[PDB]
Ligand binder design. Structure first.
Ligand code: E6Z
Ligand code: MG
Ligand code: ZN
Length: 333
């Protein structure tokens, strides 16, 4: 990777965010973006203030300047896509911080596990092109061909991991350079394992393994820590429906557009498209969000909360409240 310059660092350091609190469950990233000329500098400043405010990089030997360089090297590898961009990953990092520290999930994990989680949120979708794993496999795109020949169908998640390793190989952006021996190894393994767990083809497997390990904890403490890390990255990743309605709605507009674009691209390529990805078969946003809530997100959050993450109850309450709002949109169309 090329060196981060003094000017690039300075353009982040000048951002003031008076009147925002980045640790709060009601924090609004859209309003932070809209408040400035330079929304990419503001988003970088949010991630910087959040990580330093935690105390964790200081604990684990990561200097202020290595932390910032890492944040800016992540930023340069995100694309100009509608949803899977630098704003998504800064949102995921902020949200995980709320789960650790307002939902008290930090009680279930070591400090080192918490540091790894927050860093991993920023690398978890590096160089995403707005196309899912099925696109690559069905169209025989070159990365699809490499996946099948190679024997791993998590085409996207392996790519994100390759680029995380690339960034951390430069001493100027290695946030894990203060760790020793076995700890350094734990960090790399954890990071990678968590990123691989974000592929929605493993959603059901991940959730079963978590609920099994939570039913003991005692019998295998290490497997419970590992699964808790995976399940919290996954929860941050699909957290848009746990936010204030107007924030939730903006996220939904953006993801929906990436679905449509994939569908246009498959059609172009002679592949027959599922109707959720088809501009021609949909009108309003409401029914899609109600479906995502009923069939994926509401059961996921209620199960993790009931099994041991009791301090995360507000997520369920806000999901139910957003869903009633979409329901009203439908029945008074
Ligand atoms: C805020 O809304 C949303 C937020 C996220 C997703 C995601 N779905 N899936 C898949 C989609 C195919 C069906 C099988 C289950 C879920 C992904 O693999 C995406 C990539 C990684 C994680 C979740 C992502 C969908 C919606 C929606 C909607 C809507 N139709 O309104
Ligand atoms: Mg992903
Ligand atoms: Zn993601």
């Amino acid at each position: 990777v090329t060196a981060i310059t003094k000017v690039e660092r300075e353009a982040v350091l000048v951002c003031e965010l008076p009147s925002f609190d980045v640790t709060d469950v009601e924090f609004d990233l859209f309003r932070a973006r809209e408040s400035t000329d330079k929304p990419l500098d503001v988003a970088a400043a949010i991630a910087y203030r959040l990580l330093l405010g935690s105390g964790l990089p200081q604990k684990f030997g990561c200097s202020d300047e290595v932390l910032l360089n890492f944040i800016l090297q992540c930023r340069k590898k995100y694309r100009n896509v509608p949803y899977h961009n630098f704003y998504h990953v800064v949102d995921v990092c902020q949200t995980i911080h709320t789960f650790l520290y307002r939902g008290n999930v930090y009680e279930k994990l070591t400090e080192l596990e918490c540091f790894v989680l927050l860093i991993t949120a920023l690398v978890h979708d590096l160089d995403h092109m707005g196309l899912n794993n099925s696109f690559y496999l069905k169209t025989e795109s070159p990365l699809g061909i490499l996946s099948s020949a190679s024997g791993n169908t998590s085409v996207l998640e392996v790519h994100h991991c390759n680029l995380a390793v690339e960034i951390l190989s430069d001493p100027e952006s290695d946030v894990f350079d203060g760790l020793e021996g076995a700890e350094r190894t734990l960090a790399f393994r954890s990071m990678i394992d968590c990123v691989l767990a974000t592929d929605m083809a493993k959603h059901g497997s991940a959730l079963e393994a978590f609920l099994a390990s939570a039913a003991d904890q005692s019998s295998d403490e290490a497997a419970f820590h590992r699964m808790t890390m995976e399940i919290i990255l996954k929860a941050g990743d699909i957290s848009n429906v746990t936010k204030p309605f107007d924030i939730s709605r903006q996220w939904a507009m953006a993801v929906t557009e990436e679905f449509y674009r994939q569908g246009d691209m498959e059609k172009e390529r002679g592949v027959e498209v599922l109707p959720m990805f088809d501009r021609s078969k949909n009108m309003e946003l409401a029914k899609g969000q109600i479906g995502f809530i009923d069939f994926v997100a509401a059961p996921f959050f209620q199960k993790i909360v009931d099994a041991c993450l009791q301090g995360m109850q507000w997520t369920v309450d806000r999901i139910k409240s957003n869903r009633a709002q979409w329901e009203r949109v439908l029945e008074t169309r």
